[PDB]
Design a protein around this ligand. Structure first.
Ligand SMILES: COC(=O)CCCCCC(=O)OP(=O)(O)OC[C@H]1O[C@@H](n2cnc3c(N)ncnc32)[C@H](O)[C@@H]1O
Ligand SMILES: COC(=O)CCCCCC(=O)OP(=O)(O)OC[C@H]1O[C@@H](n2cnc3c(N)ncnc32)[C@H](O)[C@@H]1O
Ligand SMILES: [C]OC(=O)[C][C][C][C][C]C(=O)O=P([O])([O])O[C][C]1O[C](N2[C]=NC3=C2N=[C]N=C3[N])[C]([O])[C]1[O]
Ligand SMILES: [Mg+2]
Ligand SMILES: [Mg+2]
Ligand SMILES: [Mg+2]
Lengths: 528, 528, 528
C-alpha cells in the first residue's frame, strides 16, 4: 500500500495505545490472571490458530460466551485478521438465534459450555458452520488447547480502514432481527472521540489511566458500549466477573478495588439492595447507567452511598454512545435532589455529534426545552444501513439523517430529556402525548405493581390511551378508583386534563419480551 | 454527497465540540473581550467577507500577525471555506519571505501594521497577490471594518476530508524553505488523538475543561502546536497576549488566572528571571516547554517555584506533536532532582505513533536505552511530502517511514532521549559520537559563554570534532587550558576518551541563523 | 510501439537529415576539428556515458559552458536518451542560478572550469545534484576522459513525441526566473518550419547547404535561436568560437570562411569598429541580428561593408523565432537608406504563425500600419505554460492566445514594427505613447550619453513620463535646455506635442540589470 496513507485500524488501538504497562493485569474472576504482555502473546496465538482453521479475510466468526478474557481477545484478534466478528445475543429465543446465524453465514462458532443446550435445539437446522469450539472455565477448554499449539508471533496485515469488523443484530420492532455493522475506522473514531470527551472533564465522571475497569453489561449487546476498546488503550487494569452474580460482583469490586464500571438500572438496584453491601465502601465507584431510563429515586439512593452515578445514551445503530451526562463544577454544589434530577437526564451530545430535534416533516423544532420531537443524528460511528435490507435502511436514513426513534425535548443548555418512543406516542386529536408519564402516574398507586399504557383508536379523536394494570398481593381496587386516582393530577393539556377516557383495565399478567421489556405490540393484538 | 459518509472536517471542531459555553470569553490582551457566541458570529462574518473578495475553494490566504483573536478566527474561517491558510514565518529574512509568498502563490495577504516595513522591501517583487489587508490594534483596523459590513449567517460547505487546510514553510537545511501541508482529516485526528492522550492523565500535566489557555509560542510556527484547535474544542477561556512582553505576560497570567500554556526555554527563563515574578504565585501553571532541548537546571528552577513543567517533542513535518512527557503516579514522589531528570526527557510516544529507532540501513536497533539511532515514525498527521518537490520528498519518506533527522536512544520503559542531530553527528572511525555532550562539557568552563562543535575531516579517522568557543568579559584563557579542561572528564569510548584531537579555537563571534540558532553549516564554510 | 505511427523526435534530425557528408568538419576554434562521422560516434559515446551514470528517462542534466562542440553534442545526446536538458544562463547572478538549479532539480551538472568560482559561492546550498563534471579546453577534460571509456554503439529508444527536451529559465519581470520548456515535436517542427521559410528565398538572406555556420549568441539563451539544430540538418560546416573575442572572431571568419552567423547589435558594432576589420573582406556574410532592436545607423554602416544584414524577432517563450525580415526582389534596388529602413524592421511572420495585434480587451485592431497594440500569437512551437506556476501561466495564455508583451503596429504589407513594451507604455489620459521615441529624441542631444524614460503618476492625467539623462565627459547642460531640446520637435498628439511636463532629471548612473539592460522597475522604486 502507501506508507504515507495512514489507515485507522483496530490493530493500532492495541500496539499504539495511550499507555502500556507490560505488568498490568487482566483478571478473569477467581479463574485467571495474566499481564498485558501475555495478553498480546495470546492475541497473536489466537490469530495463528484462526489462520490455521482457514479463516480468510472475508470470513465471519461468531461468539457465544459470557464476559471473560476470551471475549476481549476475540474483540481484537478476529477484527485484526480481517474477518468479521458476530456477537450473538444469548438472551434471544433459539429461533431468533438460528435466524441470525443463518443470516450472517458464520463459519466458526465459539460457544460456552452453558449454552450447549440451546445449540442442541438448533444445531440440526444450522448450515454454513463447519467447526464448533467449546469454551470452558477449567483446564480442558478447547480455546486454551488450541492456543497452546500456536506461536506468539504474527504479522497482522494492513487493509482498507473501511472493512467491516463487527456485527451484532439488534432486534427492535421489525418482525425479524436487523443486522448492524461497523468498520475499523468507525470503532477507532468512536474510542478516540469518547476518550477525548469523558477524559477531559474537570472532576466528575472522568475515565483516566489510574482507573480499574469492570463491565457489568452483557458485552455482546453493543461492543460493551465500546468501553473494552477504551480500557485497553489507557492500559488500565481490567476485571471480568463472568456470570453476573451480585455476591461475586461485590466481592470483586471490594477486592480488586474497581473504580469504573457500567450497568443497567436493574443490576444497580440488585447490587444496592444486596445485604452484602451494607458495610461495603462504595466511595470510589463511577457507574455509567446508560441502559434505559435511569430512575430518579434509584439515582438518589445511589448518591446517598457516595457513588458517582451518571447516565448515558446510545443505541445499537449509533456506535452506541451518543450522549453522556457531564456536570459542570458549579452543578456539583446542588443538593441531594437537584443533583439527582441532573444526573438522571439523557445528557449532552458528545463530540462530533449533531443531534437535532425534528417533527414528522423534518422541520427542526427549537431547543426551548418544552416542545418534544424525534431525535435525528449525524455522527462518525453510525451504521450506514441494515445488513441485506433496503427498505428499512431507507426508513433509517430518511432525510439525510439517522432516525433514532425516540421522542425527546432538548433544553437550551444542551441537556436532552428523552420523553417516550415514536411508536408509543399518543396522537390524540392534534397533540402528541407520551405514555411514559401516564405509566408513571398510575404506578404511584399503592396497589399497582406493573402498568402498561397503549393506544386505542377513536373515530372523532384518532387514537386514545388505554391503561393496563396488575394488582399487588391481596389487593383488589375497582377500575373506578384507579380512574379517579389519575383524575386528581393537574398541569396537562387537552380536554380538562385529558381525563374523560382513560379506560383502565386490570390484567393478571402483561406480555413481556424475552429480553425483559414490556411488549406493547403483542398487547395490541390481544385487546385490539 | 452521502449523508451517511462522514467527513472529518475542521468545521466539526467548532460546531460539534466537547463543550460549549456561550458566555465563555476570548480575550485579546487589554484590547478586546468577547464571548464564544460573538466568536462564532465573527467567524461567519469573516467567511462572508472572504466570499465577497472572490476567495474560491482552491485559493490561498496568507497571514502575517501576532497572536490575537484575529489569528484564531483565521485558523477556522479560511479552512472552512475550502481555501488554504498560509502561516508566514515573520522571523525569516525578507528574501525568504518573498520566496515563500511566490512559491505558495497567495491571493490575499493579512498583514499587521508593524510588519509593513518588511513588505516595503518586497512588495515590488510580489506578484499573484491582489489585495492587502492591514490589521491594527485600534478601531481603524481594516479587518474589523470588513467584518462590520457582513452578516453573521453562513452555510459552510461539505467537501472531501482530504482537502489541504494549512501550509507554513518550514526551513531546515536545504538551501530554500520547504513547504509542508496538512488536511482537514489530519488536523481533526491530531486534536482528537492528543486530547485523548493528555486529558486522560491521572493527576499530572492534564488539559481539562476547567483550564484557561494561553499561547506563548509564535502561533505561526506549526499550528501553535495544535493547541488553539484543542482549546476551542474544550470551550475553555482563551487569552492572547500579543507581542510577548514578560511584563505583560506576567500581569496577564496573574490577572486572567492562566493555568495552561506552552513556550520555549528562553521565554520561560525570561519569565522566571523577571523581577516582577518574585512575589507572583505560580502554583497553578502547566507549561509544556517543547521548543528545543529543555535544560535540566531550568526545569529544576521552575520546579522550585511550583510549576508543572514537562517537555514535549514534535517538528514541522509531524503534526507537530509526537511525544509528551507524562509521569506515572509513583514517579511524582521523587525528589527535587530525579523529577527534573524525568521531566526534561523527550517523552513517550503519543497514541497512534510508532516511533522506532533505526540505523543508516534501516535495521531497527533495540530499545535498550544505550544504543543511539535515528527516529523514524508513522502517524496519522504526517505531511505526505514537500510542496512542489520530489527528491527531498523521497529522502523524507525513505524506506516507507518518515525520517525525523534526530539521533536518540529509546529506553525500555518507552522514554525517549534525543541525543543529537543526524547532520551534526561525528562518525569518527566507526563510531558515532554526539556534538551536544562535547558542547555541554566545554560550557561548564568558567570563561566560556557560547560554544560550537563541528566536524573536521581526517584521512585516517574520517572526520573529527573541532571546538569553537567565545570568551567572557575580560577573560583570556589559552587554548591549551581549554583542551585540558575536557581532558579531565571520563566515561567515554574511542582512543582513551577521544581526547588527543579536540582542536579548540577561540572565535569572537559565532554565526547565527536569523531564527536564533547556531549556524554550523555556514561555520563549515568559513573554516573548512 | 506502432511502427506506422511516426513520432517527431530529435533523433530523426541527426540520423535522417537533409544532407549528410561524412567528411564535413565540426571545428572548435583552434582547439579541435573532427568530421561528422566522429561527431555521431561521440554522440553515441556520450549516450553510453550518461547511461552509465544512471541518467534515466525522466532525469535532468544541466550544462554551464561556452560554445563548443561539447554543447552541440549535449544538444543531441541528452534529449535523445529521454532526459531533459537545462541550459543555465551564466550571466545571471549566482543567487538566481541557485534558484534555477533548485527549481529544475538537476542531477548531473556539466560546468566549464572558468565557471568554478561561481559554483564555489553556491555549491554549499545546492541539493539534488550528485555528480559534477568539469569541462576544460586541454587534454585533461573530464568530459573527454568519460567519452574515451565508452563505445561508439548505442540504440536510441523510441518514446512519445510530447516528451520534454529542453528548459532554460527565462527571467523577465516577475521577481523570480520563469521556466519555459519544449518537446521533441515542437523543436522538430521549429527547425522544419524555419528551414522551409528562410531556405526558399530567392536571392537574399537564405541558408542553404553550401553555407558555413557560426553562432555568436550565448547558445544557452534560447536553443541558440534553434540554428544549431538546423545547421546539422543541412550537414554544413560548423565553427564554434568559444569566448567571443572580436580579435578571434574576425580571424575565424576570415580563415574558416564563415558565411552565415547571428549576433546582437552590440557584438556586431564591436566587430565593425575593431581595427582588425578595415582590410577584411565581409562580402560573404549573412548576419541575422535578432537580439533586440537593430538600430538603423548600425544597419547602414554594416550595409556599407557589403554585409547581408537583416533582423529577426522571437522570445524565450516562442521557440524562439516568430518573424524574420525577408526582402522581395524589387526591394533590393532601393538605396543606401531605404534598404536600411526595411532591414531594421521586425519582419514578417514566419510560416505557421498567426501574429495578430490586439488591445487590452482583445479586440484585434486593424493592420493599417499606424495603430499600435500588443502582439498575440499562435504557433506550433510555443511553451504551454511556465514550469510549476499557475497564475503567470494564465496571464501568459489569456484569451486563448500567447501574449508577447510587446506593443507594435503591423503594416498592411505584413511588416511588423515593434514600438515599445507593454509595461513601458505611457497611458497618459486616454492615449498610449511609447517611451522609446522619447528616449531616441533626448539621445540626439550632444551632451547626453544614456537616457531612460519612466512614468510618473498625475492625478488629472493618470501617469506621465519622466526623463533621466546621464551627461557626457565635462558636459554640463541644465535641465531647462534639455527640456527645450525636445520642445522643438513636432508631429505628435496630446497637448501641443505632449510638451508641458517632460520633467527631465540628471542622474550620474542609471541602474542596470546584470544581463546589460536598463532596469526601469528598480528605477521606479528609487524615485517614486
Ligand atoms: C454511555 O454508554 C451507553 O450508555 C451506551 C448505551 C447503549 C444502549 C444500546 C441499546 O440499549 O441498543 P438498543 O436495544 O437499540 O437500545 C435502544 C433504546 O435504548 C433506550 N435508551 C438507552 N439509553 C437511554 C436513556 N438514558 N434514557 C432513555 N432511554 C434510553 C432508547 O429508547 C433507545 O431507543
Ligand atoms: C531570428 O532569430 C531570432 O532573432 C531569435 C531571437 C530570440 C530572442 C530571445 C530573447 O531575446 O528572449 P527574451 O529575453 O524573452 O527576449 C524577449 C524580448 O526581446 C525583444 N526583441 C527581440 N527581438 C527584437 C526585435 N527585432 N526588435 C525589438 N525587440 C526585440 C522583444 O522585446 C522581446 O520581448
Ligand atoms: C508538545 O508540543 C510540542 O512541543 C510541539 C513542538 C513542535 C516544534 C516544531 C519545530 O520546533 O519545527 P522544526 O523547526 O522543524 O523543529 C524541529 C526540531 O526541533 C527539535 N526539538 C523539538 N523538541 C525537542 C527538540 N529537540 C530536543 N528535545 C525536544 N524536546 C528537534 O531537533 C527537531 O528536529
Ligand atoms: Mg435501537
Ligand atoms: Mg523539522
Ligand atoms: Mg520573453
Amino acid at each position: 500500500n502507501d506508507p504515507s496513507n495512514y489507515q485507522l485500524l483496530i490493530k493500532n488501538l492495541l500496539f499504539s495505545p495511550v499507555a502500556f504497562n507490560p505488568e498490568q493485569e487482566i483478571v478473569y474472576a477467581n479463574h485467571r490472571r495474566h499481564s498485558y504482555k501475555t495478553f498480546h502473546d495470546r492475541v497473536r496465538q489466537f490469530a495463528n490458530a484462526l489462520t490455521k482453521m482457514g479463516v480468510k479475510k472475508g470470513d465471519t466468526v461468531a461468539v457465544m460466551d459470557y464476559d471473560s478474557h476470551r471475549y476481549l481477545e476475540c474483540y481484537f484478534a478476529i477484527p485484526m485478521i480481517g474477518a468479521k466478528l458476530h456477537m450473538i445475543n444469548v438472551r434471544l429465543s433459539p429461533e431468533q438465534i438460528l435466524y441470525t446465524i443463518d443470516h450472517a453465514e458464520d463459519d466458526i462458532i465459539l460457544i460456552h459450555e452453558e449454552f450447549l443446550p440451546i445449540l442442541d435445539q438448533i444445531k440440526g437446522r444450522i448450515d454454513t458452520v463447519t467447526r464448533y469450539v467449546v469454551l470452558r472455565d477449567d483446564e480442558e477448554c478447547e480455546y486454551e488447547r488450541l492456543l497452546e499449539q500456536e506461536s506468539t508471533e504474527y504479522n497482522f496485515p494492513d487493509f482498507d480502514e473501511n472493512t467491516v469488523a463487527t456485527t451484532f443484530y439488534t432486534t427492535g420492532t421489525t418482525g425479524f432481527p436487523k443486522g448492524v455493522f461497523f468498520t475499523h475506522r468507525q470503532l477507532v473514531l468512536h474510542t478516540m472521540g469518547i476518550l477525548s470527551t469523558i477524559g477531559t472533564n474537570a472532576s466528575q465522571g472522568r475515565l483516566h489511566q489510574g482507573d480499574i475497569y469492570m463491565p457489568i453489561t452483557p458485552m455482546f449487546h453493543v461492543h460493551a458500549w465500546g468501553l473494552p476498546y477504551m480500557a485497553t488503550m489507557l492500559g488500565v487494569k481490567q476485571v471480568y466477573p463472568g456470570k453476573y452474580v451480585p455476591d461475586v460482583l461485590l466481592n470483586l469490586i471490594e477486592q480488586e478495588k474497581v473504580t469504573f464500571s457500567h450497568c443497567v438500572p436493574t443490576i444497580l438496584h440488585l447490587l444496592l439492595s444486596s445485604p452484602k453491601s451494607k458495610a461495603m465502601d462504595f466511595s470510589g465507584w463511577k457507574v455509567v447507567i446508560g441502559g434505559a431510563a435511569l430512575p430518579k429515586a434509584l439515582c438518589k439512593s445511589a448518591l446517598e452511598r457516595d457513588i458517582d452515578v451518571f447516565a448515558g445514551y446510545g443505541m445499537s445503530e449509533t456506535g452506541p454512545i451518543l450522549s453522556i451526562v457531564q456536570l459542570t463544577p458549579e452543578q456539583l454544589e446542588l443538593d441531594v435532589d437537584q443533583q439527582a434530577e441532573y444526573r438522571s437526564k439523557t445528557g449532552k451530545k458528545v463530540a462530533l455529534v449533531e443531534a437535532y430535534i425534528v417533527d414528522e416533516d423534518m422541520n427542526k423544532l427549537p431547543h426551548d426545552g418544552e416542545t418534544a420531537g424525534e431525535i435525528v443524528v449525524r455522527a462518525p460511528w453510525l451504521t450506514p444501513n441494515y445488513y441485506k435490507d433496503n427498505k428499512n435502511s431507507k426508513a433509517l436514513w430518511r432525510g439525510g439523517y439517522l432516525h433514532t426513534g425516540d421522542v425527546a425535548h432538548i433544553d437550551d443548555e444542551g441537556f436532552i430529556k428523552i420523553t417516550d418512543r415514536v411508536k408509543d406516542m399518543i396522537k390524540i386529536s392534534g397533540e402528541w402525548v407520551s405514555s411514559l408519564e401516564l405509566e408513571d402516574i398510575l404506578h404511584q398507586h399503592q396497589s399497582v405493581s406493573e402498568v402498561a399504557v397503549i393506544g386505542m383508536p377513536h373515530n372523532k379523536w384518532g387514537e386514545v390511551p388505554l391503561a393496563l394494570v396488575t394488582l399487588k398481593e391481596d389487593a383488589q381496587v375497582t377500575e373506578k378508583e384507579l380512574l379517579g386516582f389519575a383524575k386528581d393530577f393537574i398541569n396537562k393539556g387537552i380536554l380538562a386534563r385529558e381525563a374523560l377516557l382513560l379506560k383502565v383495565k386490570i390484567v393478571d399478567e402483561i406480555a413481556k419480551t424475552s429480553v425483559g421489556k414490556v411488549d406493547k405490540k403483542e398487547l395490541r393484538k390481544l385487546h385490539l
